[PDB]
Design a protein that fits this description.
- The structure is a homodimer.
- Chain A has one helix and no strands.
- Chains A and B meet through α1 of A and α1 of B.
- Chains A, B: This is TYRO protein tyrosine kinase-binding protein.
- Chains A, B: It is found in: Cell membrane.
- Chains A, B: Belongs to the TYROBP family.
Chain lengths: ~35, ~35
Amino acid sequence: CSTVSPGVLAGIVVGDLVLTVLIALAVYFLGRL
Amino acid sequence: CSTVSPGVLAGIVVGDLVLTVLIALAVYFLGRL
């Protein structure tokens, strides 16, 4: 029944926040205010 | 078994790809300084 254990999926969303913040942070730093 | 519903999770991975190409397209096109 869906295995009710989406561990990997949860791993991807975590990576999602890290993705947006990683590239967004990169441009932010380069922009320098 | 339970509700859980790992559907939204799948939706997030899709969003992950969107983030990669979105920011990547932004910086590649013309990273504002």
